[PDB]
Design a protein around this ligand. Structure first.
Ligand SMILES: Nc1ncnc2c1ncn2[C@@H]1O[C@H](COP(=O)(O)OP(=O)(O)O)[C@@H](O)[C@H]1O
Ligand SMILES: [Mg+2]
Length: 450
């Protein structure tokens, strides 16, 4: 029987879940690959559902605060480069270069590079021992961290600070919570107004902060909504806004992850946003491309990709929002890709002309989104009204290179805007291109042989 330990505090939301404190010991009914486990506390003896991502086996590597598992080099750098982190802030992760190996990622400063992250491979020997340098070996990652927490001994710096972890969202609000009562939601702060409804910050069952989108009655069939919502429910990625729950009865409420920095469009035309440098803008582009590459892998289609439907979190985290919904709009104009509410400036010609919405028409939309990113959120086709856009683009008009956009990114936009959808790049390629946009001759890792 496995004893689990709580990685974070969890506050009870229902009559059937179990509250616990970080460090609390728990046992479960079944080690399912589900999001919620039936548990009891070895501390309190209380019984209830717990979020499975809030625990790890006791004395597991996953139980360590500094162990971040399958995080990429890029995402580790995002966390480590936070300006609140002292020099020597660190985490350990799986290598993405070498199977079964690990990586020590440490925040450093030198006048040569300023704030930077050093990456050290931790080789695991087939014989079982761990090392960065073959001359200093350890029976465990715990002993390796304990050691370099005292002496740098070749490292850029001593391990001072465990990289802070933002407390993770649960997968779903509660076990089998999906179609929820309207009265379980409180709408607190109006965040904004779209063409088809409003979005509120609010609470589920009193205490869980969520975003709530309220659709005007007549917007979409509750029947069609629930069928699509079952597809949307299956989409799970770090760069997609989670769909939590629905109120199926009109007026339809859509409950999603609250993103505290708002839309990318407003962010770009804001205080932090309007002074962002190209490398920051390319990193945001690469995050959006990764979310859409997941959409692509899942054989799904966004249908409304634009800066307004990217939401921003801490550390310039960008997530894709409002995927799939556009198909369900009943409005006759919108359905005909016509009228004041249709985003013609983001729409591939074959989608606008024939209603052929595919991942390739989302690639077109991504190219337009790149113009928003490189012009601080300027409206595409600035000198044109919506009623004249499709005519121009079908005749082969394309936006020129924005004034502060490098030609290479404009060339990428032009590939996204190929007349033939099958000639447009994949999101897989767009993500690989944008992630490797800037080249360095710098060592990928710090060589272990010193
Ligand atoms: N999940 C969310 N978290 C936080 N704010 C959100 C979220 N979804 C939407 N918003 C806010 O609500 C506004 C309106 O969204 P929406 O109704 O989808 O309209 P549009 O996509 O046309 O801008 C967004 O600009 C943003 O400010
Ligand atoms: Mg939106």
């Amino acid at each position: 029987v496995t004893t689990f330990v709580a990685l974070y505090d969890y506050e009870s939301r229902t009559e059937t879940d179990l509250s616990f404190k970080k460090g609390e010991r728990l046992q479960i009914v079944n080690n399912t690959e589900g999001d919620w486990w039936l548990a009891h506390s070895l501390s309190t003896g209380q019984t209830g559902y717990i979020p499975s991502n809030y625990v790890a086996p006791s004395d597991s590597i996953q139980a360590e605060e500094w162990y971040f598992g399958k995080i990429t080099r890029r995402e580790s750098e995002r966390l480590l480069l936070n300006a609140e982190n002292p020099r020597g802030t660190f985490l350990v992760r799986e290598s993405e270069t070498t199977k079964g190996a690990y990586c020590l990622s440490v925040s450093d400063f030198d006048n040569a590079k300023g704030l930077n992250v050093k990456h050290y491979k931790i080789r695991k020997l087939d014989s079982g021992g761990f090392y960065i340098t073959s001359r200093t070996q350890f029976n465990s990652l715990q002993q390796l961290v304990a050691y370099y927490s005292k002496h740098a001994d070749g490292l850029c710096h001593r391990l001072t600070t465990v990289c802070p972890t933002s407390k993770p969202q649960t997968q779903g609000l509660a076990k089998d919570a999906w179609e929820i009562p309207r009265e379980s939601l409180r709408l607190e702060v109006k965040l904004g107004q779209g063409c088809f409804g409003e979005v509120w910050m609010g609470t589920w069952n009193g205490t869980t902060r969520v975003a709530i989108k309220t659709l005007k009655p007549g917007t979409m069939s509750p029947e069609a909504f629930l069928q699509e919502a079952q597809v949307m429910k299956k989409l799970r990625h770090e760069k997609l806004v989670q769909l939590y729950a629905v109120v199926s009865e009109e007026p339809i409420y859509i409950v999603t992850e609250y993103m505290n920095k708002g839309s990318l469009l407003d962010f770009l035309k804001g205080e932090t946003g309007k002074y962002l440098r190209l490398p920051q803008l390319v990193d945001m582009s690469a995050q959006i491309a990764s979310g859409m590459a997941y959409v692509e892998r899942m054989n799904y289609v966004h249908r409304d990709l634009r800066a307004a439907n990217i939401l921003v979190g801490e550390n310039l985290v960008c997530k894709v929002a409002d995927f799939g919904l556009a198909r369900l709009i009943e409005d006759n104009e919108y359905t005909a890709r016509q009228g004041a509410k249709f985003p013609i400036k983001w729409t591939a010609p074959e989608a606008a002309l024939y209603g052929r919405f595919t991942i390739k028409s989302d690639v077109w939309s991504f190219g337009i989104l790149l113009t928003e990113l490189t012009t601080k959120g300027r409206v595409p086709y600035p000198g044109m009204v919506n009623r004249e856009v499709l005519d121009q683009v079908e005749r082969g008009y394309r936006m020129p290179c924005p004034p502060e956009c490098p030609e290479s990114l404009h060339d990428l936009m032009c590939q996204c805007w190929r007349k033939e959808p099958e000639e447009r790049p994949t999101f897989e390629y767009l993500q690989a291109f944008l992630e490797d946009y800037f080249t360095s001759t710098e060592p990928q890792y710090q060589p272990g042989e010193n």
